[PDB]
């Protein structure tokens, strides 16, 4: 029950927006979250759910 790249940079932005960062980067990660998760879909979450994944 783990997700590499998707979590990898997923948290990167999560930390950025937490410590106050640019939206451009936060959304950038949001994408890697939706994109990477789609690549992931191994056998745990299927299109893993990181945190943002294009959160509104």
Swiss-Prot record:
WHEP-TRS domain residues: 3-51
Superkingdom, taxonomy of origin: Eukaryota
Residues modified to Phosphotyrosine: 48
Location in or out of the cell: Cytoplasm, Cytosol; Membrane
Residues annotated with N6-acetyllysine modification: 37
Subunit structure: Homodimer. Part of the aminoacyl-tRNA synthetase multienzyme complex, also know as multisynthetase complex, that is composed of the tRNA ligases for Arg (RARS1), Asp (DARS1), Gln (QARS1), Ile (IARS1), Leu (LARS1), Lys (KARS1), Met (MARS1) the bifunctional ligase for Glu and Pro (EPRS1) and the auxiliary subunits AIMP1/p43, AIMP2/p38 and EEF1E1/p18. Forms a linear complex that contains MARS1, EEF1E1, EPRS1 and AIMP2 that is at the core of the multisubunit complex. Interacts with TARS3. Interacts with DUS2L. Component of the GAIT complex which is composed of EPRS1, RPL13A and GAPDH.
Domain notes: The WHEP-TRS domains are involved in RNA binding.
Family, similarity comment: In the N-terminal section; belongs to the class-I aminoacyl-tRNA synthetase family. Glutamate--tRNA ligase type 2 subfamily.
Function: Multifunctional protein which primarily functions within the aminoacyl-tRNA synthetase multienzyme complex, also known as multisynthetase complex. Within the complex it catalyzes the attachment of both L-glutamate and L-proline to their cognate tRNAs in a two-step reaction where the amino acid is first activated by ATP to form a covalent intermediate with AMP. Subsequently, the activated amino acid is transferred to the acceptor end of the cognate tRNA to form L-glutamyl-tRNA(Glu) and L-prolyl-tRNA(Pro).
Protein name from the UniProt record: Bifunctional glutamate/proline--tRNA ligase
Species of the source: Cricetulus griseus (Chinese hamster)
Encoding gene, per UniProt annotation: EPRS1
């Amino acid at each position: 029950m783990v997700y590499d790249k998707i979590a990898a940079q997923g948290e990167v932005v999560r930390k950025l927006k937490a410590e106050k960062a640019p939206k451009a980067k936060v959304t950038e990660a949001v994408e890697c979250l939706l994109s990477l998760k789609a690549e992931y879909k191994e056998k745990t979450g299927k299109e893993y759910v990181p945190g943002l994944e294009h959160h509104h």
